[PDB]
Amino acid sequence: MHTETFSYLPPLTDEEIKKQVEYILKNGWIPGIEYTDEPGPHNSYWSFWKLPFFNAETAEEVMEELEACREANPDCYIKITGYDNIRQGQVLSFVAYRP
Amino acid sequence: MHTETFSYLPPLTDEEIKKQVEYILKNGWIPGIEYTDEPGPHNSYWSFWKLPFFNAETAEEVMEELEACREANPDCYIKITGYDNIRQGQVLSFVAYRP
Amino acid sequence: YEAGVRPYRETYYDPDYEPKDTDLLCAFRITPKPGVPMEEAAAAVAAESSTGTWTEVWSNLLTDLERYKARCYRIEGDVAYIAYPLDLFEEGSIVNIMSSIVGNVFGFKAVQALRLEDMRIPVAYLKTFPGPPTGIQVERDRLNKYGRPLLGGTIKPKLGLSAKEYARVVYECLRGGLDTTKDDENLNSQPFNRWRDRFLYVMEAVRKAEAETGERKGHWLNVTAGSTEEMLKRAEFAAELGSRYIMVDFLTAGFAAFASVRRRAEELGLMLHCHRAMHAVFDRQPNHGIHFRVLAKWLRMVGGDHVHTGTVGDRAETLGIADLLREDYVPADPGRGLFFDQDWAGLKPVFPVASGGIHVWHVPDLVSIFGDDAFFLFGGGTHGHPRGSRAGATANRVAVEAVVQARNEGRDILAEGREILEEAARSCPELREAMELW
Amino acid sequence: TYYDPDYEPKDTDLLCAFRITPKPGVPMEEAAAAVAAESSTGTWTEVWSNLLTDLERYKARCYRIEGDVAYIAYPLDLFEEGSIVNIMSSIVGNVFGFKAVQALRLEDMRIPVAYLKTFPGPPTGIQVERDRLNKYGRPLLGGTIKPKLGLSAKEYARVVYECLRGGLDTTKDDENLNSQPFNRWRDRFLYVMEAVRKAEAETGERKGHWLNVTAGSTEEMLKRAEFAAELGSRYIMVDFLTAGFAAFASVRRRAEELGLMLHCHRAMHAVFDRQPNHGIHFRVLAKWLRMVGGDHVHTGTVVGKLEGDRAETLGIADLLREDYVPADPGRGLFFDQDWAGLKPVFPVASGGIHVWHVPDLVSIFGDDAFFLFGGGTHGHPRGSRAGATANRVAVEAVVQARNEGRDILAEGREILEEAARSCPELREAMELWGDVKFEV
Amino acid sequence: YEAGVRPYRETYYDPDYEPKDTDLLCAFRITPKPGVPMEEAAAAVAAESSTGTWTEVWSNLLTDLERYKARCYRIEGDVAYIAYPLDLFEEGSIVNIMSSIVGNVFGFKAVQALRLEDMRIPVAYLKTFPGPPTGIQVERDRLNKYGRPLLGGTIKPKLGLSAKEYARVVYECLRGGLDTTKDDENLNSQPFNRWRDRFLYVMEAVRKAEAETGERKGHWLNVTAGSTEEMLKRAEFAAELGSRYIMVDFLTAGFAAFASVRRRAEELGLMLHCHRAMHAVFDRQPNHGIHFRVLAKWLRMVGGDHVHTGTVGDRAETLGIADLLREDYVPADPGRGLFFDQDWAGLKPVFPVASGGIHVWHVPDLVSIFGDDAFFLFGGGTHGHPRGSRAGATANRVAVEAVVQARNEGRDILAEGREILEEAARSCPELREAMELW
Amino acid sequence: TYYDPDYEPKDTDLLCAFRITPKPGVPMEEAAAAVAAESSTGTWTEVWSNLLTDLERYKARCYRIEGDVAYIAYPLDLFEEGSIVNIMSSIVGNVFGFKAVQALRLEDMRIPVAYLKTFPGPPTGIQVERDRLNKYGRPLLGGTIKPKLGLSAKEYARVVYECLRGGLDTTKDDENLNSQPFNRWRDRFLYVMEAVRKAEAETGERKGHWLNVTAGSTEEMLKRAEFAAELGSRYIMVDFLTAGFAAFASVRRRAEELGLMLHCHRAMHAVFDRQPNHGIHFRVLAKWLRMVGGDHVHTGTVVGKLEGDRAETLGIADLLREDYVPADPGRGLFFDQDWAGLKPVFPVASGGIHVWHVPDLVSIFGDDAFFLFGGGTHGHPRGSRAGATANRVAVEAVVQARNEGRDILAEGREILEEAARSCPELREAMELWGDVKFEV
């Protein structure tokens, strides 16, 4: 099973994930974290980990939430999202962790 | 049988008709002359007497055409029309002569 | 993101905002609750009629509130000017406009009284509306009537009369020279007077009067009913009988059903008279409600061929409404309650209708006020004539034509109104009698 | 003759209570007679055709005046069966603009049983609706999605998902959300129903979203109702005043045919039901609403951001839910009202309420009502799911307290504080909005 | 009134005219017949595309030509700027725009060659059009695909292949990582390949590939047919099978039928790929025809979800077209052939599609040019892979994702395009092979 | 292999004559082969799935090249039956934008009889149309109402009335007159038909108006066709290129069902049929038009304001009217064309013509054609009725002269001058436009 963007590349390291988060922030978008144990074509609403981090100022703050979500949900897929409120749509979504 | 505007007043004299023509011209509208022997609710296209007098500068010029139409068609109803090309519609129509 | 309650003013009051030509603008007369600043009351109206609510929500940051929010951009006296982005509205839907502009904001504790005075509908939004199904010019073409106001009258008693007789009153009015007659707004289908019976016998009277006089006639058959389907049924039957007109109480039936009847009317070739029954529930008080001029704009946007305008509320007010209905551009004039310029983007014009206890003596004033493009209704002013509806119709027709003749001849119909009518009365016994009665 | 203090109203008569502010110099007796005439038969001059009828059979009569209140009786045969539109055209059609009155308010109306039987009433009704939801013994939880406008269809349904899975029974489109460039209705309807099904499966409780079919024409509203039914939605929503009663009746008929429950938003009501001197009191609008057939209608909160009197609201809830409501001057009920077996309507309390208002809301409405928390759900410090849990828990804790014999007004704060000990979401909501009060 | 022939210039050339925001503007490149002045040729185009003809007619004076006539208001070089009043056009009808702007004026003896370069659609007229039935944002939501270009490919041979096998090629492409596949523009229903058979077996392949990969898939099923009714039938069947997409050749089928399919697509929840077959008949030569950017504007107005944009005609030209399809406002830039500013009045954006003999080596350039919001089509670039469609699809998918990753990390994907692909090839044998082949 | 000079075309093959301007360095033989491949099967790289088929059955083949003209044969099974849309998608779908050609013009196409039989052809046809009109032995008279746009519906029909009662057989909406704020289609359709009936009763000759149903969607065009038929109109009109062939086919089917005759305006054709180096020659468009089914189509005037070659126009008229047209290099007819019994189409000559052109027009077209005088009717010094009489008389005088054995070209002026002696309207038209000539 693939999980869309970047799922055809090798699994991302934490430093690669962090650079994607920096790309989200540098462009003024809102990073978010979601997780599910049931990925697939019929699931368009993964579980929110907290809320989209509107107040995050650094990529490391997001990475700390990722590690906390990863520790809390070790048997779930976990993805990073990037939301553009001017576009009213996600501009980036990729799985950061796989069970 | 009535013929719409002014048909409930006494028949108009030539001086009354002329004043209506002056009203048409003073407001920058186009006077015209039409005639028919079959007035009624089913007739919305009387016969043209020449064309609408786009070039008429005085009411008397129109009155001369009325007298010529009246002489040529003594057994017809004859009406004066006033057309507003900015409105794309007639702004005055009344029968000037009855057989 | 910070949860909690913030003043509406911080987000929805922006006196630096410059309205765009595509913005929809509103002028609200605001009476704040004592202790609530005017800027906060105005911002509350803007917020709760566009995007905001009473407390900050995380989902606000999922959209572009700078683009979508309404903004109070000017407060002058007790009038708040609020601009609404074009993207907030559904194309071609008066119902949507109402659901935002007048949906909830009139009932807030922080605003003790609220009156919508005027609205600037932008040209780009007006073009999503069809406008009148006929329009003044096409209507005059269908009637073959040019150069004078058109005359009508309501068949009376309002409720009570039977069918074949109700139609005898129609026949008498129309054969006497009235162009039209009409149902009362509350005459729909009732045990005393069912609609199918009335439609059938009224139209027999219209065909007869038209054949005898030689002038085209009509009756504004009221299709107002409890459901949209029933109204469309009654409109179909009116068309099957060859009626040139139908009638709808557009406020009591409602705008959604009004839009449905307007579409069917154009498809069937029917002209649509619009009765404004219930308008005074909304528009009577100067401190709270919706002024009729706003209702008139929505009326022209959906598409009515005529609408009542009153008798003369105020003269300045009525002249403003007549312009809003008939002209392609109406400049602002707060003296007439017009707070904005209104470009009508090529929508057809609406006939204003003057009605309400008027008779021959009012014709000089009415012609001076409205000119040719209006309907003058003589309800009791026709049936109450000493010799009945027929003679009353003749008196009214002669009075209008005589005044129009004098005007066209260059006479001052206001200063000579009395003399003009007395001149015409010398050759019309019906007019002389009517002038004596009233 | 239109004022007849010796006239005894018939059980078939339609009765109206008008508060009249006459033009100066117009005495109350004559103003009431004028209202009766213009709302029934009267004209302004004698007419020959009046002699061909028996107007006495159709005249309305003012039969009692107290102060500035006129009671007027209308014969049954004046009105078209099953048409609220006809009632309005006659009762509030022209008498509000008449010259001889400066202001006029319709306070109440006695709908006779013989006229009520020409109406179908709600398509579902409280009892059948609770059966369809399998929810008994508590007020039902709802909430408007916010921002009112601006969310995409997919993000809009994300908020729906968070609300419903957190404990709300329903969510709803804002009254002004129909179909707009930023959020077209077909996109919204599809994504919302995906969220509804998802939250229902995960919680084990039946869910719903009040999808707004309000549109510019009746035909378009029916089309949107059809699509909602094709998606299996239990609900649609209509702004019955802005759309209008004629199109509202059309939508109500279709709703019953399709098996849809019908939420009714009263947008525009405050334009003419607010001021005490002019307009139509909402209790009249509520009667008309129940006659045509709404399954819910907003009634106000009393304690929220929008105006509403506690006593009047108590009477309106009874008018919507009971089969017989006796007159009650303290609540502004001028007439006894029998409902002739018409189904009852859910009152809905919405607007600026939060957890601290739940004791008041339960006290006012009891179990048969919806409590809507829009800002009071999404405004929770941790978002919509936590907010929904806080509101659901507060409602259940108060219902439990009441059922156990506690005075939920006297112990309202204590009850909420007890529940908060086992519900951190409620604790956080109580802290955030503890100082947010409106005038009552 | 004076009968007789007058130069078009006397009435339809007005260099003093100031265009209104509601005017529709055209920029025509005019090659006059030798001996015909440029002002007369430009006035002839304006006249014969609005109100005038070759000789004065009495009926001209029955309307308001100052209001309705088109006017050439500026000639710069060989480009004539002509303004058309809003009232000349039927709301929501691209067909009407064409019937006026390009109806007859391209065939006049007085104008030897004529090329429509650009058109300024006013905001008030754009709002009468629905735009794309889905739009980029909603389409990405329906697909659950964010943060990269989307990949497609045409199943080949163009014409010749059978049904259950045609679908095996689809299955292999999609299971290898392409998001979509498509019918050839000229594959409709033919004796070798009938549409019902193809639709049934293609969709079985889509469901299978979607289930195995876990990613949402689609095939652009071509509903193009000889009549509008037949196209709607094929769209209904595609929807009944659960297809997320249909496809129409919007120029060969025509705009009227295109509008019909766009409406049905939105009603059925189908996304609408638009193939621009025949465009080069109109838009190839620089001296005569209609430039594609004008066709692209009409395409976005009627409502297509994607449209092909070519491969890289010119780079500047393509960037202008991509902006016209995706942005809410596009400023003028004659260097890119954009002669006017274009406000899109909130219409949804269209996906540009790059197609035509492209393979892995072009991905760095394509990402730099288009960014995330575009479709990259690999027709033969997928099936021609050494190990077949499946491996070719994987190579293309990896190449796109690898380049997007590098871009997001801050790397210069143009200067490092080669290095990036070779880095990704070390962990993807399919990519290494594809790079060796082409 | 896509160039095969030894291939003999089959009677079932579809044949194309392309004028190719190849990219520099691309020889003609290879460019023709590339056009054949891209318009049939070929790809740009080898594909594994090609081995699962027999492409030889579907390949198009260039079988002859002379100069810059390539003859290409396409198998019958490549095309969808009865779909001009499919022909265009294949034959002119991508090969005009291909890199290896700088310019490309489709000069002619041989439609095989076996493919023609899948099309219905005109719904009425010349013979049945003349029967429906009861008009035999002369070209038929028509004219576009002017101004193109701006007239109200009622004034628009006044001009129609004057034209028809003066001797024109028909009148027509301008191609760009559909439904606009100044003139909505329902208003126009009603008033026009009142004028048509009036002129028919007064003259004793059957009349018609080509009511334009062209609209933004197929459904809207069908609606306008329905209304025209309900009014008893003998005709509707469609811009078949701007509306498009798919919607055109839908309208043609409905026209036959309703009994409507179908006038076809070729608006937009000059965008791509004018220049000799690129596009599609109109003669091809005329074949496609006759296949789908138009009752008339404009063909140009040769002598009027719009471009058109006399020899090419002679061939196009034959292609529209005859059942078999042999190849003719002098007229640009590259192939013999059998029409398989399809009904014939009226050619229509329109654009900048007046009385002095009638001898030329009769000489070029003969009797089976419409001559349209728009400006040449309304531009008459005394208006539309006089102008219509002048044009009708000129046509009849020339037809009479020809039938009597006169050379109407050598005696053209003399013939008109004779008729003018008995027709002052013609005399005045001849004086006004005597010096108005276009280049031929």
Ligand SMILES: O=C(O)[C@@](O)(COP(=O)(O)O)[C@H](O)[C@H](O)COP(=O)(O)O
């Ligand atoms: O019922 C009536 O009073 C009328 O029929 C007038 O009767 P008369 O002509 O016999 O007075 C009209 O409906 C009102 O004028 C409308 O009021 P508005 O102008 O307020 O809509």
Ligand SMILES: O=C(O)[C@@](O)(COP(=O)(O)O)[C@H](O)[C@H](O)COP(=O)(O)O
């Ligand atoms: O638009 C609004 O304000 C609401 O969504 C409340 O949102 P919050 O829950 O965020 O306040 C409701 O429509 C109002 O309560 C209706 O007023 P009523 O119920 O009085 O008709």
Ligand SMILES: O=C(O)[C@@](O)(COP(=O)(O)O)[C@H](O)[C@H](O)COP(=O)(O)O
């Ligand atoms: O038929 C073809 O050539 C394609 O399927 C590409 O095949 P490959 O991907 O195998 O080349 C496309 O339709 C063209 O690219 C469209 O041309 P345009 O961009 O001119 O519309």
Ligand SMILES: O=C(O)[C@@](O)(COP(=O)(O)O)[C@H](O)[C@H](O)COP(=O)(O)O
């Ligand atoms: O719009 C016009 O110019 C016309 O109405 C001619 O008007 P006049 O009769 O006043 O010239 C016709 O549509 C053209 O002849 C069509 O060109 P073609 O016949 O070549 O398609």
Ligand SMILES: [Mg+2]
């Ligand atoms: Mg009335």
Ligand SMILES: [Mg+2]
């Ligand atoms: Mg709301």
Ligand SMILES: [Mg+2]
């Ligand atoms: Mg292709």
Ligand SMILES: [Mg+2]
């Ligand atoms: Mg034309």
